[PDB]
Amino acid sequence: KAPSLKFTAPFGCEIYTNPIRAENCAVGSIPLAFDIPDALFTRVSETPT
């Protein structure tokens, strides 16, 4: 029994059991898309300047 994947995983993952899953593997990057409606854009003079 060469040690578990809990202790040997690259990027510092955190292997768990009941769903077989890894946690918090610091690798890659998430892109994001924001479809923002036009109602949220407050005008200039309703904010300090």
Binding site: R43, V44, S45, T49
Partner: protein, 49 residues
Amino acid sequence: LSAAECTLNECVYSSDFGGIATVKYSASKSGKCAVHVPSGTATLKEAAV
């Protein structure tokens, strides 16, 4: 008036009255009178302030 200065707070060339100009003046008498733009550059909302 005497020594009046005009700055543009909001400026958006929208179809409605979408621009705010705050005229910083210094008046000899305190009384209402009429503002106007001679050109077709801007169309003012109110006739007097």
